[PDB]
């Protein structure tokens, strides 16, 4: 049955929400929503509650809503961020018009704990295992993040961590440009459109994030995307014969190809003092063909995580039917299957 909704205006925004969300206060906002942190006073949890900006305003708009709601509806892993409700004010389709998600609460990320935090060589196994363990789950559903950096990864007090997207907006040309985070952790194939990419460009940014771990350094902070090219073909080689082949790209191909020839480095010359294992592992994640390097379910197996991997409690995923990404519809089409998603949600136990 329906919950009592009440409203407030929050900077320039309505927000109307069930009664059990109390003390919203803003934490963020963008193109595509506004978020407030709360209470919910049903479940005593901290909460986040995301309401979608304009959720209908274009197909492209309307697939992404659906899009998201689909996805946040299931995803059930612990090192993953869940759906703990899913509303909207409307009291029918000829009504709806505003969406709001809600999750825990993931109040500090991984930026902050290398910023300001020293880290062991066991902080970096925990912490790394579980990015994988979340990874395996993901990947098995045929879902790739594609954008996996520190600031999208939350940890909590007791150093367990969940992978979310908090990007309430668009990765534009000009957002990727220059000396900028946003492209730091990003695989050469997606930065520069060498082929037709996969699950594997999440590997390569796992890769680049346990070197910060380790060294409290970015691993490829280039000036632009030609200078990070650079920086990454000195430490991993330039491209052989048969890499080459597989760039699609005749213009990117030829681009790579006027390079000086360069050798793979000494990763235990670059790592100083890092764990063997440790610096094994980064061998087998940053390899420049994305056909050969290790898949987060070989890596749950590899020596380094001896103390936490557990084959038993590694899960994978349900089905997830992704048939959609290929329809095209109308708007009032894919608002209505977002409906029903709204309507069939069930809450965790
Ligand atoms: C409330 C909400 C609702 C939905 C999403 N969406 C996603 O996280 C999301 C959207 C699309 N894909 C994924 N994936 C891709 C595959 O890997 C798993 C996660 C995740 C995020 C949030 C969210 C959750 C928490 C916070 C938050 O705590 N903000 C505080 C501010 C200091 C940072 C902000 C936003």
Redesign the pocket.
Known sequence: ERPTFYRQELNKTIWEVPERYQNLSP??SGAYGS?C?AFDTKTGLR????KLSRPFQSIIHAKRTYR?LR??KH?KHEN??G?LDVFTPARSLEEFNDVY???????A?LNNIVKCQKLTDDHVQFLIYQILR?LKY?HSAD???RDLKPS?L?VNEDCELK??????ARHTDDEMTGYVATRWYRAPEIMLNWMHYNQTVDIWSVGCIMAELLTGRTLFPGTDHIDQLKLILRLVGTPGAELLKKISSESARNYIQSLTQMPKMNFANVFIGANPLAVDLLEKMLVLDSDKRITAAQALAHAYFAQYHDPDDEPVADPYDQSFESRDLLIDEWKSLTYDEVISFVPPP
């Open positions: 934490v963020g978020v942190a909460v986040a509650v995301k998201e996805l946040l995803m993953v961020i759906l998600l809600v999750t825990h609460l993931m109040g990320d979340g993901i879902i790739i993040h999208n939350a992978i979310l997207d908090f990007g309430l």
